[PDB]
Design a protein around this ligand. Sequence first.
Ligand SMILES: [Mg+2]
Lengths: 1109, 49
Amino acid sequence: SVPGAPNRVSFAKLREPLEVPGLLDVQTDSFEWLVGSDRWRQAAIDRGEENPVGGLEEVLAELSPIEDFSGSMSLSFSDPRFDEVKASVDECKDKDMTYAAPLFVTAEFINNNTGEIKSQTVFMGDFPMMTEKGTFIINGTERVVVSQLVRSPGVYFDETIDKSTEKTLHSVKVIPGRGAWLEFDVDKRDTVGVRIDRKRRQPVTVLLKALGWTNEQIVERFGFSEIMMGTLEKDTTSGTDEALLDIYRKLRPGEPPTKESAQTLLENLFFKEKRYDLARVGRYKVNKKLGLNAGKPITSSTLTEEDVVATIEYLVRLHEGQTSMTVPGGVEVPVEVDDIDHFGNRRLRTVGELIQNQIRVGLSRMERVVRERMTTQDVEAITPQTLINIRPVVAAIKEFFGTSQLSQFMDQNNPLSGLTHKRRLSALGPGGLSRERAGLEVRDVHPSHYGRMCPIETPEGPNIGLIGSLSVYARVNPFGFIETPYRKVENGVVTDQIDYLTADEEDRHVVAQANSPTDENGRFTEDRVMVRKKGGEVEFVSADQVDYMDVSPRQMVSVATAMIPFLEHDDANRALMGANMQRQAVPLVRSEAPLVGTGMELRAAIDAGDVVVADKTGVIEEVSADYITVMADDGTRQSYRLRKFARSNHGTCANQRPIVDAGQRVEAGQVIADGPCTQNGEMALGKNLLVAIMPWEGHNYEDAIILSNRLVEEDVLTSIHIEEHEIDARDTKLGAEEITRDIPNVSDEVLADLDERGIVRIGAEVRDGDILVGKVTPKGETELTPEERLLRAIFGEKAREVRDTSLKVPHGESGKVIGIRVFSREDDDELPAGVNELVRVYVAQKRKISDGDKLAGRHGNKGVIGKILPVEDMPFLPDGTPVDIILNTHGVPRRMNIGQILETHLGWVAKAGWNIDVAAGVPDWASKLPEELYSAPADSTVATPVFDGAQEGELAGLLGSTLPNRDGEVMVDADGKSTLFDGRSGEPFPYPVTVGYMYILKLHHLVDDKIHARSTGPYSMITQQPLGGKAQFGGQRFGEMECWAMQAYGAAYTLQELLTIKSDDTVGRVKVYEAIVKGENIPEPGIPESFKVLLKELQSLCLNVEVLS
Amino acid sequence: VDLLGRNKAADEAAERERREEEAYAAGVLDLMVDREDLMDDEDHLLAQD
Ligand SMILES: [Mg+2]
């Protein structure tokens, strides 16, 4: 497999014919196509393409050439070339730059009148590039562009039933995606109407005549369907010219009707590439659907003369009932109704196409003024620069990378989160569906997800169903259709002829399961095989009817879902919860790979990029906590920087540590360093803890969890959290506010940790309310009150012109300062307008597990930590081992996630080695185990691949073959249960309980970030109500339902006091505070601002609203 | 009478009832908990979506 590959025996019985492809290929291949890299060219030409064109070249060719209105000048662009990136990734991230490369294009100007030629290279600007991890470094932040899901333009056929007087009507709408509309629909009057540009129903014969058809040809060719005969009978147009004139009159009656303009408008409407285009994917879709112009390549971006007639003929065939059709000049194709949820119609807009669209818009905006500058300047004095402004294109590309919904912050919580984020399929954004629309119609699992979109893993938030993840075995078709691999089957024998097919290509075949038993040679051993039909239905067919076969059992699950052991035993809802929870695991101080897992732990770690892999074979020159040096066989040195204690976007600590030593031979692709949540190159999101399944004094009641104090003492569930505090100093109308150690009206003890320039020293410890960096602002008018005047006269402290505005540690936060960054205009830093200085301080803290912190496994079992008992209190095994965690029994069977019990049993089996009595012959249960899995030592790691894992019988048999402990006795019997002594009373529990090892992980939902409180604080400017939305001093919302509850209680006084005194009652609020502080009884509430304001407003409308007794 | 039928001539009142009902529902949806301050175990979908 891979060079390192820590030994992890697998329970798989099937053979993998195809290795898992590059998980981050979707984000890289699209961009390689966009910039037309050499390797992309080689791959495209080797596929069977001639003269392939990249995205940038395609856009330039579409725009070029451009000719002026006079027709005497022409401008063209060609040969886009890229330069070396300005700086490296690390430098750009440190200095908040943008990782980009200069872009150059060869522009050529031709003077038609004379013949002058001007060729030169124009600087297009800095094109944002991407790293090897499929991320963009924008202003020092790692952003990710998620592939969008859109409806491919083309011709679609639908049929509905009229709900007024029964019967059915069929329609066809042509979606170009860049032009106008053109559809044909059938009414209940035995006719065929065409509604051009969605304006008004017109006869189809009118359109036919307009194109240049006559009655004789229509009656000679369209002699199959009677409805069209009736339409022609109803038609009043005689000649072709009248049809054009009639269409022009019906379209725009206002303008004068003339034959020439009538033809020109229709010619302009759809038969021009400058007004109507199919985006070079609609043409392919129409060719595949209608079947015209098959074989030969097509470059036209309009509707062919035969396309319209073929579409109309297909519509009438569909109404007629014909299941087959063919036209001269094409290939016979079937007849059926299309649906919008099917992926033969839904394409994928990857990062390359998303960038291409914005580049196209920018180039159009530039050309708008390019032609104007041509028409406003003098001739024989014009060079390419003098008529090319690069401002608009750069502005457009910059705006797309900082405002577009598709491009957003990369989830840096852990490697798996980032990996899943990169390969995400969103169904919203520019040109997509709204978040408040498409209910239970587009978010349902269509039978076409199988092999192209994971049907179980999806966000549970507002975006349920709209957002999904690509499957393990899937790669986007150059056109943009997700295709999946399948094994060719001929004459009932499976062969090694893997073929990638799309959804529509798959609807014409019969595919079988991957686990279907097969003979040694390859023939099918059974007769009836389970397969999938063309309708997305499962059926048993003959062995000869099998056409294809799945590559592997886990062809439908995603990367996140494939990390869940025993996924076939968990319910769909629980599997979804676990898959979405696995992306919220905070990296721990010391990671450890799971005892029981799948085969996806390794790959997911390497593809995520959170590890360092040797580029070429060599010997480790030296190893340090900061970098690794390796000498290759060719004598070329390589040095890898190890980013140490680096803050992730979400606040988790991201750091790497070497796992190699000097003199170690390393092969290409071997992991030499591991990331935050990786051990020996395998993902280690959580920890293996000893778990006993039993209720305990009600402390684990309602999904609560009891933990041992050992986890706290040994830092089993401890994490590092880093936060950044930023503050700026700028020029103001009263002067420029400066950062200074000196602060007015404050003691010298509070600022004992400040440095010479007024910033907290690195390594200092800070709690809430501590000064991080001094800052003062000009105040202005003082006008001291006599009380203050006398008070400061007795003290003698004269007035100070400045007011303290130093940065303070937010309430509830504490830690140590680990880094300080300073930017200033004095040193030519690129600060925003008016800002003189900027200071960032990083505070890192060592957060241990504590009560209320969420904690969950991989099977959707979640819970807060209700109590942390001391070591002696926890139940302990007879050998004296105290269990680390206790999970309530009542919550397992109901949630229908029995897979966690299997994980527990197999984890116990893995922790203590096993030895099957194979000396006398393989037992019946062990006859299926691979030869390598008959015996393993203690602390072994095993793999149970999803849908091809350990069977229940094999696990039950293994449970009865576990090795003894140091004393020489077995703790867990054949049933998976063990006796536990009570830690408080000492009496053994009356019945044995399930005990094992479970892999559980700490979620980011910590208590420290979810605690709020208010007594008195900031108030809104307009409503005068307490403001919220922030954890410092945010107020709670008292909705109308709570008011109903209070009214039901009859709690009149509480409701009044809560609606007025504690909200928008300025007069009485201060009185209430004064009464509370003075010990006086609270006064009666007044009248809320919400009523006085209402009264004044309603009076302002000339309404004489008055009160009376 | 069946051939003549009815035309629903300028049924403005029906539109007023439609607007009243639509005006009511927007309040009903607003009544329910918003995502600003949610206090559920995880951020689940809401009827407003
Ligand atoms: Mg809950």
